[PDB]
């Protein structure tokens, strides 16, 4: 067990319904592997710095889950299967390194 | 890797007495743990030569200690080998 951060950027053109199905599959997978959502920050959509998948925006998802290391790579590989899932960035959580504080 | 508990387990399982952390036996045990864990790693990544340098060093560090033990208490020696299941 280790604490990670599953970042996910989704298709900025999903209707309240579409957003939901994809967003659940995310929930579905997280379980099948051994994740445990401690918190989420559906920041929603923002203007990308460069066009990703031909769009100037992306719908952002965040999670401070905890799971079994030997699966992190496998799970991430899974989330990516979806076509509305255009980004999967998983990161080992870290102690905030302040500065100029 | 090797977690505190795992580590702590073997230590206890080998301390010559409560509190014994750095005895020849404890060391050889601990070393054997690493050597083995590492040995398995190499069976997989046969190309990780650098790590293999380390393996080589431990195997040697172990020989050194065991050699010492066997010259000081040939008994605890046979005992430790038996437990750890070393030698040939």
């Amino acid at each position: 067990m280790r604490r990670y951060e599953v970042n996910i950027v989704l298709n900025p053109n999903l209707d309240q319904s579409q957003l939901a199905l994809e967003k659940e599959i995310i929930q579905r997978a997280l379980e099948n592997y051994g994740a445990r959502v401690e918190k989420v920050e559906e920041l929603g959509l923002r203007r990308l710095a460069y066009p990703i998948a031909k769009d100037p925006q992306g719908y952002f998802l965040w999670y401070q889950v905890e799971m079994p290391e030997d699966r992190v790579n496998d799970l991430a590989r899974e989330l990516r299967i979806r076509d509305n899932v255009r980004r999967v960035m998983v990161v080992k959580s870290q102690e905030p390194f302040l500065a100029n504080a | 890797p090797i977690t505190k508990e795992e580590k702590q387990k073997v230590i206890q399982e080998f301390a010559r007495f409560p509190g014994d952390t750095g005895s020849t036996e404890v060391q050889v045990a601990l070393l054997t743990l690493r050597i083995n864990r590492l040995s398995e790693h190499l069976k997989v990544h046969k190309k990780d030569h650098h790590s293999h340098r380390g393996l080589l060093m431990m195997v040697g560090q172990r020989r050194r200690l065991l050699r010492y033990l066997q010259r000081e208490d040939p008994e605890r020696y046979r005992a430790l080998i038996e437990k750890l299941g070393i030698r040939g």
Binding site: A49, P96, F97, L98, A99, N100, A101 | -
Partner: protein
């Protein structure tokens, strides 16, 4: 000579490890989406190092740019 104000001084407390605060990270990139030098970021080697890491993360997410077009001239 790398004059003017340093990016660190011109700012408050922040988490150099937070690869999502575009508002603050965005400050360490030049006019072009390039990562600013210590001379300019006013950071310590150790800090500067951590920055580069998070910035690179922000870029891959799309939050920050990899490069921008030079304006004026």
């Amino acid at each position: 000579p790398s004059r003017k104000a340093k990016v660190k001084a011109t700012l408050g407390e922040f988490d150099l490890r937070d690869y999502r605060n575009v508002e603050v990270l965005k400050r360490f990139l030049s006019e072009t989406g390039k990562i600013l030098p210590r001379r300019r970021t006013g950071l310590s080697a150790k800090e500067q190092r951590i920055l580069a890491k998070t910035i690179k993360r922000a870029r891959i997410l799309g939050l920050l740019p990899f490069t921008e077009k030079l304006v004026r001239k």
